[PDB]
Amino acid sequence: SVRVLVDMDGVLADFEAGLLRGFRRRFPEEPHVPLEQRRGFLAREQYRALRPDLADKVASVYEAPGFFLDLEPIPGALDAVREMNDLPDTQVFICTSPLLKYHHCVGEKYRWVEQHLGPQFVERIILTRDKTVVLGDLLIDDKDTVRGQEETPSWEHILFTCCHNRHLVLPPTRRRLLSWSDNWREILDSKR
Amino acid sequence: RSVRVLVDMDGVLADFEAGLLRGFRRRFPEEPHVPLEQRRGFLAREQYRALRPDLADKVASVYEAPGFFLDLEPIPGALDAVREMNDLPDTQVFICTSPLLKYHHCVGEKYRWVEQHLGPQFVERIILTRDKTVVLGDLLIDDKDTVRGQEETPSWEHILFTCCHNRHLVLPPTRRRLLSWSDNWREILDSKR
Numbered sequence: 001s002v003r004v005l006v007d008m009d010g011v012l013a014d015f016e017a018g019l020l021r022g023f024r025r026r027f028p029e030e031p032h033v034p035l036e037q038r039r040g041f042l043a044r045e046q047y048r049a050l051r052p053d054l055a056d057k058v059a060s061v062y063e064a065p066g067f068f069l070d071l072e073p074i075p076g077a078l079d080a081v082r083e084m085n086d087l088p089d090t091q092v093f094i095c096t097s098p099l100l101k102y103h104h105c106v107g108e109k110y111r112w113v114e115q116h117l118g119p120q121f122v123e124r125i126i127l128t129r130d131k132t133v134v135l136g137d138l139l140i141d142d143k144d145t146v147r148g149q150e151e152t153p154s155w156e157h158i159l160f161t162c163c164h165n166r167h168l169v170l171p172p173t174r175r176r177l178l179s180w181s182d183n184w185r186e187i188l189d190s191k192r
Numbered sequence: 193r194s195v196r197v198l199v200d201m202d203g204v205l206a207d208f209e210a211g212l213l214r215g216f217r218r219r220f221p222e223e224p225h226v227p228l229e230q231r232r233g234f235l236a237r238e239q240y241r242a243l244r245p246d247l248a249d250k251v252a253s254v255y256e257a258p259g260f261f262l263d264l265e266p267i268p269g270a271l272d273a274v275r276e277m278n279d280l281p282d283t284q285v286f287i288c289t290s291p292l293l294k295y296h297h298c299v300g301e302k303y304r305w306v307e308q309h310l311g312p313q314f315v316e317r318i319i320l321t322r323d324k325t326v327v328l329g330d331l332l333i334d335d336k337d338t339v340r341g342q343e344e345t346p347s348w349e350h351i352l353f354t355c356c357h358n359r360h361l362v363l364p365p366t367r368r369r370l371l372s373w374s375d376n377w378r379e380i381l382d383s384k385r
């Protein structure tokens with residue numbers, strides 16, 4: 001069997017659109033970063049560069065009760081995970097990291113999966129700050145580089161395209177998925 | 193080379209069995225109960241069902257309630273051992289633990305228990321999973337009789353941590369039981385160096 005590890009934020013759940021909508025509702029007078037202009041993984045650091053006090057303002061949006069629970073699905077994501085898990089000789093886990101400020105993040109992620117995908121998918125969640133100690137063939141994740149205690153992880157990292165990484169320059173050794181309407185089946189087939 | 197040790201929570205760091213009995217005797221004082229050293233088998237709910245059918249839902253209501261996981265007491269010597277272990281040269285520790293199927297009052301409470309008893313540096317070392325066989329390490333210290341999942345041959349050696357429900361088992365000469373945190377765990381780690 002081929003085991004596929006799938007990230008949540010930026011892959012299944014639209015974190016960036018949720019953050020922007022929440023910031024504009026809470027701070028309606030303030031300048032913002034349009035999604036098309038996002039660069040670098042941590043949104044907070046781009047807001048800090050725009051004006052220093054904006055860093056703590058935008059963090060207050062994603063640290064608030066309800067933020068993770070209310071995120072909208074990425075187009076095609078839920079249907080793709082359903083199809084993937086049903087394929088012969090294929091196993092799926094949802095492998096996701098909590099914030100350091102974990103309080104309103106850990107339980108809300110479990111409930112989001114229960115509502116959008118159902119109870120059977122809740123049993124496939126792995127919560128960890130270090131994905132390199134998880135065994136699998138593939139990791140689908142929008143983070144530029146995924147690191148931890150294992151210098152050479154068991155999995156190949158497939159970069160999932162998101163507003164913040166679209167402009168990032170990659171060598172031919174690093175593979176990219178453009179969206180869930182791109183050819184993910186061929187990637188899985190390369191590990192069989 | 194570094195030795196990676198995966199450490200379970202219930203029955204190893206936190207006293208689930210004592211907490212469950214205390215809560216049951218408080219909420220259901222008239223009902224029959226199971227004394228700790230009479231426990232047999234991993235799942236307490238099924239021994240209570242065997243005692244009388246109506247007791248299965250009653251004992252489950254105790255461990256599914258708000259505050260149950262948050263309020264568990266530490267196992268003797270456990271917190272000092274994990275601190276000492278994480279401080280050793282060429283040694284790494286993760287707390288590798290599973291949520292209930294009824295996850296609502298379990299997931300967040302386990303994170304807060306670690307924060308309070310061991311601090312923020314240990315919160316970052318939590319791995320939550322229903323399948324421990326897909327986690328890479330040298331040793332897994334866990335009171336469950338057999339730890340199973342998708343990998344038929346896990347990377348880790350399972351060290352059975354002694355608890356009321358498993359005390360009756362006798363291991364063959366090819367395997368190792370840890371009697372308590374005073375039972376020379378350093379020698380077990382040294383076998384992997």
Ligand SMILES: O=c1ccn([C@H]2C[C@H](O)[C@@H](CO)O2)c(=O)[nH]1
Nearest residue numbers: 009015041042043044097098099
């Ligand atoms: O700017 C941020 C900050 C956090 N996260 C997500 C990634 C991960 O799944 C979780 C914890 O870092 O929150 C983002 O996607 N963007």
Ligand SMILES: O=c1ccn([C@H]2C[C@H](O)[C@@H](CO)O2)c(=O)[nH]1
Nearest residue numbers: 202208234235236237290291292
């Ligand atoms: O009777 C039970 C039921 C659950 N758990 C613990 C084991 C695991 O860490 C978590 C989820 O099964 O709860 C026990 O220790 N005993």
Ligand code: ALF
Nearest residue numbers: 007008009096097
């Ligand atoms: F859900 Al993530 F990094 F985006 F674990």
Ligand code: ALF
Nearest residue numbers: 200201202289290
């Ligand atoms: F904390 Al456990 F099985 F007892 F994961």
Ligand SMILES: [Mg+2]
Nearest residue numbers: 007009010142
């Ligand atoms: Mg992500």
Ligand SMILES: [Mg+2]
Nearest residue numbers: 200202203335
């Ligand atoms: Mg246990």
